[PDB]
Ligand binder design. Structure first.
Ligand SMILES: CCCCCCCCCCCO[C@@H]1O[C@H](CO)[C@@H](O[C@H]2O[C@H](CO)[C@@H](O)[C@H](O)[C@H]2O)[C@H](O)[C@H]1O
Ligand SMILES: CCCCCCCCCCCO[C@@H]1O[C@H](CO)[C@@H](O[C@H]2O[C@H](CO)[C@@H](O)[C@H](O)[C@H]2O)[C@H](O)[C@H]1O
Ligand SMILES: CCCCCCCCCCCO[C@@H]1O[C@H](CO)[C@@H](O[C@H]2O[C@H](CO)[C@@H](O)[C@H](O)[C@H]2O)[C@H](O)[C@H]1O
Lengths: 1024, 200, 100, 200, 50, 50
């Protein structure tokens, strides 16, 4: 292997060339995304029941679909809501690993079997099955700057001219139009109806009858009479297209011959399908378009391509139309890629400079600078084969991996140089001798480090999804690095390096230093017991720093965005909430004029559902280069927003920086589902909710425990005295349908707009006649003998309560409660506290865990089991390396060394025990294990080839390994130093990784060079 | 009917969602609102069964009510709330009060007058017994290429979970189950393997 | 529906939803005065046709709330297509006892 | 097509689509019909059932196979525009009114089918290479002629043509990669940069 | 170089499979009877002259 | 419904569309007076059930 490629550099260079070529191919074919997919696939069905209440949706739509949702492979759980915007949403969550395509088609097929049971209106409008995502490539805002177009005009334009061309851009995945478009609106006037003795159902039926598309067959059609010499398709009846045609629909003819027409009884015109929402750009009318990235496209070219096509076709936008980009994540990924390339090139330069510093030999420095680029390019080639992408997690993997692959390069070339100088041999024999002292240790290093990293790759859940791209990129790089150290770099050393014939202050200072270090190694050996008590002191410090250091998933970057949740008091209208949102937008664009680029407002939506009392503000900040200073960052803007709007009576305003990966929520968070297991009813379930919440807010183990949804809100009930109506000759159907068409509106049929597109037709009362309960009495319905009866004859009304949002989990009514574990407390013990509270709820109220707490429950004893497997295989690999059941202990004990340094750096800088901290800590612990492995290996080989004692062997091996250890630590600390001291985008993550690894490398290398030989002599003394 | 209803309303749908359960059969059903017509009484009031089916469909309804102050509203409207008009009927008493006729003397005929109303089965096709006593039976059929032991263990676990909410007196037995056999045969061949180890 | 109605209201709508298909090669489609829409999606050689079909169906769900209600109700049909007109059987009645 | 007819390079160039066809529109004067006592629905449905036919429901054939039931006008009555006169619709009083009383004919021209290639309106053309010419030479002739078409009319190649273009344009790159691989393989096998070169 | 560039390009040769197609397209608006008669023209030629 | 009604209005209607299935092995249908139509279609071993 190593000795094989030493004798043949051509073959080793052919292999290096193949790796380099394949690496370049992967450079140009790998996907680009900010993050890999994390959360398990979820499929959601949505339904709209125009004008239906939350209860009506739950009973006529949600429960039917749920009862039909079975035979879905890998189902984890199912969660649905039903709300007052007439909306049903059913989300089915599948187990990690499920093929999302198969989950979607399985869900869609059960839904297709369910569809006939559903209300006719729901069926006619259409149901949606879609994959639930939380991320977008871009979101475009089509804005009318001069006011020429309203949101309906804008959304209509997008659907007519933009959505189709955009969909054909390579790499574009889903394209979502946030925006409603034109519909024929028939606004009935009740009094004009009564005067002509007509009902809303008359209008709907006339529309159903006159707005029709009729198949005309053909002239000369088959079978034809013999002798016919012409075919031709015949066209008879076409959909109505214009408001005039709809108004000219014939409704009635009086005896005197006059005709009653729809124009005589309603206002007819183009409007929107829905008025439930309103969206504004910087106070302008706006329509939004979300572009989601196709699977395994590169985000950067896709986004560049989309902006290019939009620029291309903006040449033909009508006057007053502009396109803005309120949401764009791709600048930040481009910046991550530039930053990683910068670090990798810096790392190559650092290995050059460090080899020259300690060796002052150009020829020896060039070997690592060939080897490192080859391994990095090969790593890209392997990433391509394995299905990874270029993303922030994998890119940080490469950043952490240079510390392992430069260590391999330095070990090889430095050990060849030492043998070649101290023993005076020519290059081929020198490399053979030097690579016969490390090849087995390098094989052992690869196995031990892979073992170190498998508890990470095999971790389950979304957190494991974070880990594995990261850790497996590190593992790929490391294994290739060991192969390159045994294939290319020995041949490069044997062919490149020449014999050595015949600053100086630096050489003298390093030699003085290594002599003082050698004497210190002896000091610690002779004082073993004192430093073993010190070792236990380090272990105790590791524990106390670890417990005190805050938990986290990813550090929260300033990505140039801020989201504002707006919740106004119950019953608020679109007009009233529009003014809290208008206040916020005006505030952002005047007081924060120099910080804020866009403020995009939508009322009608929270992040958790719809409601007139609820809205969101999406605010984009100015380019990061025009946003210097601490006052100009997003965190300070969130502080100033708390200040302005905490003292605000009209609305609840929550400013916040969006999390990088929202599906993870908060590391301290818990997600709970309180369920009606005995059919006890909504009132009983909310009684239980309020009981449980009252208990939780008193509970020191818990904090911030809130009910994820809404309290019951007042509603107005229309009571029809059906028998009084029937005594009047009025049938229940006429009453309910007249009332429903007037108030809830009705979808009648489709029509063909003047642009050739199919749109929906609605009849509802004109607004002045359905605003107030009094209006309910202005409406008329006919009796079985003709003539009109008023609702006041048989209808009264009264106020009550009802839920505006009804939640269901696994098919039974539920209420989701969400909270955090108290500071210093774990999520598992928080779950136990919640469970002991739930036990104290009335019989028949059950509960389930959902989200990340469900994930935690499923994989409970996995983390400890994986650690044991890792430790065992590390131990077994080292026993094979050392042929000893006791010597591996001198290596394994290196672990807390360096861990103390990482914890110390993080706590002293206020950072957190996040995923970045953890992966960095693993690589530094891996490097300390490697440094200890080579120290112990040389101590062993000296003890058995020059018949030394344990202390003599330990001291000489420490002399031998001191230089390469210091070389690697210097290169690595300098390499990550720019991340640990960073200004600009992504600096929180760069800090999260860099601070930890600098602390780790410092304490790891110093405590290791002093204590590893002491441990070696101690294990030799204790089990020999 | 009560046992079939409990199973249908609390066990069957979640069990039907377990991975590996291919399909689920209830020899029984959830409750059905049952309307048993009397023809002589129908003749008395000049009514046909279609009159009855039509009245149920018109008077057993959930009606979209739209909103007070809903959208699009006249400028200045500052209150909105959902309107509830008509709801599904819930008990046989409510169905018995559905209106069928206005007859000459002013009386109104109601469904209670022409039928018996009560909760029963969607179907009266089945009769199941466990050891000669009434039972509600759930047949679990394994999905194609699914693992019998895994699925059976999961469903037994979900049933163990649901047992926490059983009404007083409700018991669950497993009359037919082949996975104990497969599990025990694999267990037995393992036992023979170890006996053969000692013997060698 | 006319050819233009079909193309603009059925065919174009179905095509718009076809973004993000793995291994897309091209697509060609017809819209006739018989009311018929036929959209044929061609993938890269070697693409799994079964995966391609499941993906096309999953994308087609997006089109149904946009499609004309009648088309969405009547049903769209998705199939693995071929032009390999393999063999044609011609059934003949030589004694004349049966016509077309 | 006119250009291809004279290009000696190629033969049998034909459109794979359909020319514009004459079309016939039926204009109903709905006001006359309402004045004469017929609803728009009645006339719509009668003319569709008569001309386009209707699939009503299934029947069970004498062979035991379910088959369809169709209603349409007999051929002599649905052949020419002049025929559309004989169809009567009865009005709200039970009287009959004829089609000639309220409907008019209108000739026009239009497309029988529209083609889209990757979302762009298109027309497909197929052809053969003339005897003595290859498929590729025919495609070069086709591009030369398309170059002379009005600005804005572009083209693509599909099917066999597309795959042919892939083949022809990828071969030189594959030859280059193949030469490179043989070079590196012999370089490795024979530990020399001079042997593979003297071979290549 | 010149011999490669000069060589006409193709994908696959046209093998005689023992089968042939004849596509017939009559003026738009023509009837089934008219096309039946052109198809018969082709069938008669193939079955008598060929 | 009777077994014959079930066969004429459901089972034959569904069966006439069970064509174009990859790996079709055989098909077995039953129609009964309980109003049930059951059509089981068996495929070759190794056919993907999805
Ligand atoms: C047109 C306007 C400009 C474009 C808009 C940008 C849209 C894409 C950006 C990210 C959207 O991602 C969305 O973000 C919000 C806040 O993180 C998440 O919401 C999360 O937190 C909020 C409150 O903290 C809860 O209501 C909810 O339980 C939880 O899902 C939501 O789960 C995710 O779905
Ligand atoms: C050298 C060749 C080794 C073989 C290849 C595998 C490489 C790494 C080894 C990891 C072994 O795989 C690991 O197994 C354990 C034990 O079942 C799993 O844990 C699971 O099972 C046990 C019981 O069975 C439960 O207690 C626990 O809650 C559950 O998560 C864990 O989720 C998985 O990750
Ligand atoms: C199997 C395990 C248990 C047996 C342990 C055997 C060794 C214990 C001997 C005493 C330890 O402490 C010290 O050891 C070192 C060994 O180099 C000696 O001191 C010196 O010896 C060598 C000379 O060869 C020098 O090169 C070295 O710089 C110095 O340490 C000296 O003898 C004693 O002052």
């Amino acid at each position: 292997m190593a000795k094989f490629f030493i004798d043949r550099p051509i073959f080793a260079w052919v292999i290096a060339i193949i790796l380099m070529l394949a690496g370049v191919a992967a450079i140009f074919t790998l996907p680009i995304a900010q993050y890999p997919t994390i959360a398990p696939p979820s499929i959601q069905i949505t339904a709209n029941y125009p004008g239906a209440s939350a209860k009506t949706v739950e009973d006529t739509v949600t429960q039917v679909i749920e009862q039909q949702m079975s035979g879905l492979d890998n189902f984890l759980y199912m969660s649905s809501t039903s709300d007052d915007s007439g909306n049903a949403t059913i989300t089915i969550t599948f187990a990690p690993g499920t093929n999302p395509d198969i989950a979607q088609v399985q869900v869609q097929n059960k839904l297709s079997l369910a569809t006939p049971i559903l209300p006719q209106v729901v069926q006619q409008l259409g149901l949606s099955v879609t994959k639930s995502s939380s991320s977008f490539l871009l979101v475009l805002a089509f804005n009318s700057e001069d006011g020429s177009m309203n949101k309906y005009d804008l959304a209509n334009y997008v659907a007519s001219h933009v959505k189709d061309p955009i969909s054909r851009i390579n790499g574009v995945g889903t394209v979502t139009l946030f925006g409603s478009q034109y519909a024929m609106r028939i606004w009935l006037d009740p009094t004009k109806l009564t005067n002509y003795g007509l009902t809303p159902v008359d209008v709907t039926s006339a529309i159903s009858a006159q707005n029709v598309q009729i198949a005309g067959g053909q002239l000369g059609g088959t079978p034809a009479v013999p002798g016919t010499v012409l075919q031709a398709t015949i066209t008879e009846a076409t959909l109505l297209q214009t408001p005039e045609q709809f108004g000219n629909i014939l409704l009635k003819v009086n005896q005197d011959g006059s005709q009653v027409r729809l124009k005589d009884v309603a206002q007819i015109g183009l409007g929107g399908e829905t008025y439930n929402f309103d969206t504004k750009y910087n106070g302008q009318p706006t329509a939004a378009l979300g572009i989601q990235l196709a699977t395994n496209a590169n985000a950067l070219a896709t986004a560049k391509a989309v902006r290019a096509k939009i620029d291309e076709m903006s040449a033909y936008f009508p006057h007053g139309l502009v396109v803005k980009y309120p949401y764009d994540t791709t600048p930040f990924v481009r910046l991550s890629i530039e930053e990683v390339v910068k670090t990798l090139l810096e790392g190559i330069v650092l290995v050059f400079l460090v080899m020259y510093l300690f060796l002052q030999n150009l020829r020896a420095t060039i070997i690592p600078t060939i080897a490192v680029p080859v391994v990095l390019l090969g790593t890209f080639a392997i990433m391509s084969m394995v299905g990874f992408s270029i993303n922030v997690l994998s890119m940080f993997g490469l950043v952490l991996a240079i510390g392992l692959l430069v260590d391999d390069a330095i070990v090889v070339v430095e050990n060849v140089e030492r043998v070649m100088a101290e023993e005076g041999l020519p290059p081929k024999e020198a490399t053979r001798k030097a690579m016969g002292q490390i090849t087995g240790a390098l094989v052992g290093v690869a196995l031990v480090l892979s073992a170190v990293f498998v508890p990470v790759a095999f971790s389950g859940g979304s957190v494991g999804a974070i880990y594995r791209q990261f850790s497996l990129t590190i593992v790929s790089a490391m294994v290739l690095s060991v192969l390159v150290a045994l294939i290319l770099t020995p041949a490069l050393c044997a062919t490149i390096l020449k014999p050595i014939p015949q600053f100086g202050w630096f050489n003298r200072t390093f030699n003085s230093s290594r002599d003082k270090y050698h004497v210190g190694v002896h000091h610690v050996i002779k004082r073993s017991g004192r430093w073993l008590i010190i070792y236990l002191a380090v272990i105790v410090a590791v524990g106390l720093l670890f417990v005190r250091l805050p938990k986290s998933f990813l550090p929260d970057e300033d990505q140039g965005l801020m989201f504002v949740i707006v919740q106004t008091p119950s019953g608020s209208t679109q007009e009233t909430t529009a003014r809290t949102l208008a206040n916020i937008s005006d505030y952002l664009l005047t007081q924060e004029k120099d910080i804020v680029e866009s403020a995009f407002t939508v009322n009608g939506f929270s992040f958790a559902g719809r409601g007139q009392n609820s809205g969101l503000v999406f605010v984009k900040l100015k380019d990061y280069s025009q946003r210097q200073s601490s006052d100009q960052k997003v965190q300070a803007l969130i502080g100033r927003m708390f200040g302005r709007y905490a003292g605000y009576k009209d609305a609840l305003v929550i400013p916040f920086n969006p999390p990088s990966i929202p599906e993870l929520g908060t590391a301290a968070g818990f997600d709970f589902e309180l369920t009606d297991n005995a059919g006890l009813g909504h009132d009983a379930l909310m009684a239980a909710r309020n009981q449980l919440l009252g208990m939780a807010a008193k509970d020191p183990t818990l904090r911030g425990v809130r009910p994820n949804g809404l309290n019951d809100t007042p509603q107005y009930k229309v009571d029809i005295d059906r028998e009084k109506a029937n005594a009047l000759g009025v049938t229940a159907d006429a009453i309910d349908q007249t009332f429903s068409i007037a108030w809830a509106s009705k979808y009648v049929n489709n029509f063909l707009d003047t642009d050739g597109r199919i749109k929906k037709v609605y009849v509802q009362s004109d607004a002045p006649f359905r605003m107030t309960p009094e209006d309910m009495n202005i409406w008329y319905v006919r009796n079985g003998s003709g003539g009109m009866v008023p609702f006041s004859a048989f209808a009264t009304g009264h106020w009550t309560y009802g839920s505006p949002k009804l939640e269901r989990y696994n098919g039974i009514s539920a209420m989701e409660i969400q909270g955090q574990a108290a500071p210093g407390k774990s999520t598992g013990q928080a779950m136990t506290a919640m469970e002991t509270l739930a036990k104290k709820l009335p019989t028949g109220i059950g509960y389930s865990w959902t989200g990340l707490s469900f994930q935690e429950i499923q994989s409970g004893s996995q983390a400890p089991i994986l650690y044991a497997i890792s430790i065992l295989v590390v131990f077994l690999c080292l026993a094979a390396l050392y042929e000893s059941w006791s010597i591996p202990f001198s290596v394994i004990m290196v672990v807390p060394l360096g861990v103390i340094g990482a914890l110390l750096a993080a706590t002293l800088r206020g950072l957190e025990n996040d995923v970045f901290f953890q992966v960095g800590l693993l690589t530094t612990v891996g490097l300390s294990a490697k440094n200890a492995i080579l120290i112990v290996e040389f101590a062993r080989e000296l003890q058995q080839t020059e018949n030394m004692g344990p202390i003599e062997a330990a001291l000489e091996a420490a002399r031998l390994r001191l230089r390469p250890i210091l070389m690697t630590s210097l290169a690595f600390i300098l390499g990550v130093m720019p991340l640990a001291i960073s200004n600009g985008a992504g600096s929180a993550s760069q800090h999260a990784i860099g601070t930890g690894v600098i602390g780790g490398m410092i304490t790891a290398t110093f405590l290791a060079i002093f204590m590893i030989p002491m441990f070696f002599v101690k294990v030799r003394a204790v089990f020999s």
